[PDB]
Amino acid sequence: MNTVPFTSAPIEVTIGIDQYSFNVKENQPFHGIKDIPIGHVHVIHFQHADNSSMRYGYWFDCRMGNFYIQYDPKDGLYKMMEERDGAKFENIVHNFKERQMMVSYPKIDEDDTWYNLTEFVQMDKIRKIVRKDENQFSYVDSSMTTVQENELSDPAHSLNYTVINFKSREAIRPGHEMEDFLDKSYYLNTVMLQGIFKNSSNYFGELQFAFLNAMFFGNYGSSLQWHAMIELICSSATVPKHMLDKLDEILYYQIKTLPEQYSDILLNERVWNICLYSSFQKNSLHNTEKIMENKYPELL
Amino acid sequence: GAMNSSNYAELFNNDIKLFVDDTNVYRVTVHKTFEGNVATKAINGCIFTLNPKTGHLFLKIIHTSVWAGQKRLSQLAKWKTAEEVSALVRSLPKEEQPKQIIVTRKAMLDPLEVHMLDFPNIAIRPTELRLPFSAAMSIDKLSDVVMKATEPQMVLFNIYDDWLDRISSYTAFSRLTLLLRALKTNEESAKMILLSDPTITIKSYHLWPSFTDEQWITIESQMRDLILTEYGRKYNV
C-alpha cells in the first residue's frame, strides 16, 4: 500500500484521490494520502476553494516511483514531483504516518468500483495520450484541448486521443461509401482495432481514460472522445461477443459512478438514444440500458 | 451554410454551382396483388442536376434495373444519387467542377458529403428555398427520354432554351421556377396555358415554346393566376 506525501497545504482546496474527495483548509496540517492500492493507476486532483475554475490533476502509478505533492506559490498550483532518494522518501512518509497527518485511501473491501473504471487503463498508454516524457506521471486539467479539437492550439499541452471521424477517408473505403457509413464494422475492426489500437484492451483503456478525464476535470474534449468510441462500437453490425459483453460492463460502472447532478453536461442525448434504441447493438447492452433507464430516464 | 432568400443573388455569380434534386430518382406505382396485398412497381427515374447560371441540366436517367434485388430502396436512392453526382463531378474537367453543390432535400447532405470526401473544397449545402424541381417530369421531352430509357443514360439539356440571349440568369431562373411551380400545382391547366395557341411551337432543340418577350409576359401572368386560383382552392381563402 503506497503513499503520496504532501510537503504542506498552503491554500484551501478540495483534493480528490480517484472517486473520493476531501476538503483541506488554508495551512491545515495535511501531509498526504496513504494506503493507496497497488495494481491500479490513480489520479490525484485539485479544485482551489478561491477559484473553482481549472480542476487539474495527476495520473500516476506508485509502482513507477516515489511521488509527492508540493504547492508552487509562483505557478499557483499543487505540483506532483518524483523523489529519487528512496531513504529520504521512506523517512518523510514514516514521520507523517507516525504523526497521523495523512488521510487513508478509503476503500471498502467489497468495492470493485475503481478496478471496474480502470480495468484496461495502463500508465504507459496515458503517457502517449499526455506527452511530457521527463515525468513518470501525467498532468490533465479542465481546459486542455484534444488533437481533434485543435484541427477544427499549443500542441505540447494537447490530449493526443486517437482521432475518430465518421465522415473521413479513414472511416470510408472508396466504393463502399453507403456500406461503411451505415455499418462502421470495417472502421472499428480493420482500421481501429487491427490497425491503430492492436487489440480491444488498448481501445477500452482509451475509452475508460477519456471518461475519467471528462468526469474528474469536466474536460469537454475527453467527453467527445468517450462518446465517439461508444458510438463507433454501437454503429458496427459485426463486433466480437466478448467486446460487447465487456463494453456493457464498462459503461454500467461509468453510468453508476457519474454524479446524478452532472448527467446534463456529461451525457450526449443523441449518442445514448442512438446507442440503446436504434443502433445494431441496441439489444447487446442490457446492464447499461437498465441502469440508464432507472437513473437518467429524462435524457432518454 | 443554408441557401435562402437572403443570399439568392449568389446563384447567378461566376462561382460554378449545381442544384441536385433527388425527388424523381426512385418512382413507383402502388398496386393490389392477386392475394389482395399491396406491392410497388418501380418506373424509370432521374437525377435533376442543374447549373442555375447557365441552364445546363445533367439529367441522369435511373433505369429500374438499378433497384433489382436491393433492399430499403428509398435509402439506397439517396446513396445512388450521391454516387452519380460524384461520378459526374469526376467526369468534368477541373475548371468545370462546381465550387458548391446545393441539395434540395436535407436527407441528401450526408450521402453526398461522404461520396465527395475526395473533394474537400466543394461545399455541400442545403437550401431553405422550396424549389419545384419535382415537376421536371411534367416537361414532356424530359418525361419522354426517362420513360423510353432501356439502360442507364446521361442526357444533357439547356433548361432555359435560348432565353439567356434576351434575359439575365436571375430572370431565367425566376421564369423556370414559376413554370415548374404552376406545373406542380395544376399540371393540366399549366400545359393548357403553354400550348393553347397552336401558332407558337417548341423548336426540335428546345423544351418550351418559342414565345416573344410580350407573349412571355402574358404566359407568366397566366401562370401566377393559376397558382393563386389553385391556392384559393386548397385553403378556402
Curated annotation (Swiss-Prot), chain A:
Tell me, which GO biological process terms does this entry list?
Answer: spliceosomal snRNP assembly; spliceosomal tri-snRNP complex assembly
Q: Which residues are recorded with the post-translational modification Phosphothreonine?
A: T257
Query: What protein family is recorded?
Result: Belongs to the AAR2 family.
* Disulfide bonds listed in the record: none
Which residues does the record list as Phosphoserine (modified residue)?
A: S236
- Give yes or no: UniProt keyword Cell inner membrane: no
Name this protein carries in UniProt: A1 cistron-splicing factor AAR2
Q: How does it assemble?
A: Heterodimer. Interacts with PRP8 (via RNase H homology domain and MPN domain), competing with BRR2 for the same binding site. Component of a U5 snRNP complex that contains at least the U5 snRNA, PRP8, SNU114, AAR2, SMB1, SMD1, SMD2, SMD3, SME1, SMX2 and SMX3, but is not a component of the U4/U6-U5 tri-snRNP complex.
Q: What InterPro entries does its record include?
A: AAR2, AAR2_C, AAR2_C_sf, Aar2_N, AAR2_N_sf
Function, as annotated, reads: Component of the U5 snRNP complex that is required for spliceosome assembly and for pre-mRNA splicing. Involved in splicing pre-mRNA of the A1 cistron and other genes that are important for cell growth.
Ordered alphabetically, the record's keywords are:
Cytoplasm, mRNA processing, mRNA splicing, Nucleus, Phosphoprotein
Per its UniProt record, what Pfam families does this chain match?
AAR2, AAR2_1st
Signal peptide residues on this chain, from the entry's feature table: none
The record makes one more remark, namely:
Present with 7330 molecules/cell in log phase SD medium.
Question: Outcome of mutating S236 to D/E, per the record?
Answer: Disrupts interaction with PRP8
Q: Name one GO cellular component term.
A: cytoplasm
Protein's cellular compartments: Cytoplasm; Nucleus
Major localisation:
cytoplasm
Region of interest called Leucine-zipper, as start-end residue ranges on this chain: 244-265
* UniProt modification remark: Phosphorylated on serine and tyrosine residues.
Quick check: keyword Transferase in the entry? no
From Swiss-Prot, chain B:
* Region annotated RNase H homology domain, chain positions: 7-237
Outcome of swapping T104A: Reduced growth at 30 degrees Celsius. Strongly reduced growth at 16 degrees Celsius
Disulfide topology? none
State the coiled-coil residue ranges: none
Q: Where in the cell is it found?
A: Nucleus
Note in the entry = Present with 468 molecules/cell in log phase SD medium.
What does the domain comment read? The MPN (JAB/Mov34) domain has structural similarity with deubiquitinating enzymes, but lacks the residues that would bind the catalytic metal ion. Contains a region with structural similarity to reverse transcriptase, presenting the classical thumb, fingers and palm architecture, but lacks enzyme activity, since the essential metal-binding residues are not conserved.
Q: How does it assemble?
A: Component of the U4/U6-U5 tri-snRNP complex composed of the U4, U6 and U5 snRNAs and at least PRP3, PRP4, PRP6, PRP8, PRP18, PRP31, PRP38, SNU13, SNU23, SNU66, SNU114, SPP381, SMB1, SMD1, SMD2, SMD3, SMX2, SMX3, LSM2, LSM3, LSM4, LSM5, LSM6, LSM7, LSM8, BRR2 and DIB1.
Q: What does this protein do?
A: Functions as a scaffold that mediates the ordered assembly of spliceosomal proteins and snRNAs. Required for association of BRR2 with the spliceosomal U5 snRNP, and the subsequent assembly of the U4/U6-U5 tri-snRNP complex. Functions as a scaffold that positions spliceosomal U2, U5 and U6 snRNAs at splice sites on pre-mRNA substrates, so that splicing can occur. Interacts with both the 5' and the 3' splice site, as well as the branch region. Has a role in branch site-3' splice site selection. Associates with the branch site-3' splice 3'-exon region. Also has a role in cell cycle.
Name recorded for this polypeptide: Pre-mRNA-splicing factor 8
